[PDB]
């Protein structure tokens, strides 16, 4: 369990809902890349990885196909034991120290996501935001649950309230985590 | 409310002392229950929960399946580590250190740095390491950068200068930021 | 350039 560097080559995910799937590689808790299974392309998270590293997207499509085949057999073996919804933990914090004028990024850490089906959206003064919103894939955890991170590139003003709307089956109402400078 | 059946496969590699110690653990998970796994130290497929025996016994019986998984210590773990040295293990991001007074409390904001290895200390005037500081755990930004906020229970005086000493492997000399 | 290695999952018994 104890090691200098922990890596995952990779995190193979498939679920009955959709049916949707995910394939990504991780190193020391950070995502290297994710394979866009529909577009059949490898999307690297760093500019350094895009220039010096490559991955065959065919490996992901074949692995998810094995996962699709394996899931159906284990459902019958478990006697249709469905996944129980978990209460997620939402935390909102800035990337750099907040200073009016300097460009900053708002991070919305959504921990303990199970099953991996979540809607993370941003709200500024009650209005939905889509501009400058980036989202990472489902990052694996040791307890076999997931965590997703959402970003919001903004400029802190004199009066501008921000909220992170998280929609999950583990919650009856969408959880809102407020943030203000 | 909607019914969902989740399946997970995690092919993990554990590296210690570079290429000296390497361990592979392929985890087969149904929802959140890990039923089957293959440990490189074990050498064979083993059942974790009562949902694992049919899978583990079938994978151990097949000679081609066992030979492939045993060989994965060199074909994927040792192979990708050589590729990791050229990019990820060579990646060094210098942290941004700033002090903000929150006026009987000082916060040392160490922002955007890689790797995780960091040592932050709060000093009172000159060579007096304070023992009354509360540091936040290593915060993961997710975009290959880390941040750590070190708070200090401070009482100011007429001629008091508070310095924050930050050590990171990307720097040849530590970062010292003062506050008057 | 050399491609990244990947773990192949073992197929479950269909019988």
């Amino acid at each position, epitope marked *: 369990i104890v090691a200098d560097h922990v890596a995952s080559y990779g995190v193979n995910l498939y679920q009955s809902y959709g049916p949707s799937g995910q394939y990504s590689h991780e190193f020391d808790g950070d995502e290297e890349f994710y394979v866009d299974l529909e577009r059949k392309e490898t999307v690297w998270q760093l500019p350094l990885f895009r220039r010096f590293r*490559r*991955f*065959d997207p*065919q*490996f992901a*499509l*074949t*692995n998810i*196909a*094995v996962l699709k*085949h394996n899931l159906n057999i284990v459902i019958k073996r478990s006697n249709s034991t469905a996944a129980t919804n978990e209460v997620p933990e939402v935390t909102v914090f800035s990337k750099s120290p907040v200073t009016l004028g300097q460009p900053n990024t708002l991070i919305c850490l959504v921990d303990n996501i199970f099953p991996p089906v979540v809607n993370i959206t941003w709200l500024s003064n009650g209005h939905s935001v889509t501009e400058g919103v980036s989202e990472t894939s489902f990052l694996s955890k040791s307890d076999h649950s997931f965590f997703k991170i959402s970003y919001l590139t903004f400029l802190p003003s004199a009066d501008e309230i921000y909220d992170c709307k998280v929609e999950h089956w583990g919650l009856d109402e969408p959880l809102l985590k407020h943030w203000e400078p | 409310s909607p019914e969902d059946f989740v399946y997970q496969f995690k092919g993990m590699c554990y590296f210690t002392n570079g290429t000296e110690r390497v361990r592979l653990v392929t985890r087969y998970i149904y929802n959140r229950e890990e039923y089957a796994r293959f440990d490189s130290d074990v050498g064979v497929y083993r059942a974790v929960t009562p949902l694992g025996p049919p899978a583990a016994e079938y994978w151990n019986s097949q000679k*081609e399946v066992l030979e*492939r998984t*045993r*060989a994965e*210590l*060199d*074909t*994927v773990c*040792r*192979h990708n580590y*050589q590729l990791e040295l050229r990019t990820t293990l060579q990646r060094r991001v210098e942290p941004t250190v700033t002090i903000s007074p929150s006026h009987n409390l000082l916060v040392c904001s160490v922002t955007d740095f890689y790797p995780a290895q960091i040592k932050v200390r709060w000093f009172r005037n000159d060579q007096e390491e304070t023992t009354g500081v509360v540091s936040t755990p290593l915060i993961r930004n997710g975009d290959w950068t880390f941040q750590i906020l070190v708070m200090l229970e401070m009482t100011p005086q007429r001629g008091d200068v508070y310095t924050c000493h930050v050590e990171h492997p990307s720097l040849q000399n530590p970062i010292i930021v003062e506050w008057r | 350039p*050399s*491609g*990244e*290695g*990947s773990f*192949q999952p073992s*197929q479950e018994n*269909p019988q």
Partner: T-cell receptor
Amino acid sequence: QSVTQPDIHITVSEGASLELRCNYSYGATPYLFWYVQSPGQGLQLLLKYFSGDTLVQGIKGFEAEFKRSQSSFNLRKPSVHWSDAAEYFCAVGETGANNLFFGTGTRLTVIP
Amino acid sequence: GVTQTPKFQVLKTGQSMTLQCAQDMNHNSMYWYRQDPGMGLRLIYYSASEGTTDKGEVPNGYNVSRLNKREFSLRLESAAPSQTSVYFCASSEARRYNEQFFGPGTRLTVLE
């Protein structure tokens, strides 16, 4: 990535030692294979290598040693049989590439 | 095992013929090759998984359709004398560098 076979046709007597030359282009972690193709039949894998011991033992009493410095994977047999009279192909692969490059093929005739 | 229908076929320049291939090994990847003397094996089309099709090195004058996990067919719209070759159908568990299991083969001769 490519594979080369210098021999096109080898004629040998039954019981005599065999050596089928095969050398590969490049590979960080190569996947080297050996296939046998009998007349009127398909290709059947004899032996394979990707990791472990350099000397690999395969089916039909065949063996091969992986030379990384010489970049070759020559197939050898101490005593050849009349049933071994078939076309031999050696394939190459890589860990991070879902592709397989087959050789031109070497014809083998064993006189009983 | 891999089953290929038919075994032999004689066609005229312009005729249409479909090569049916089936495997009972629960393999995801299925392949369609053509064996020619001196050239070796040249991949036409390959299906990595069900509902997925990709071009090989010689896909001109051919079209494929993956019906299910066990069946994969090779369709010829217009026959050409350059397509006169023995066709082999292969299958592997998931990747191209896995043990490939070949069928008996289908000899094809196109005449004007």
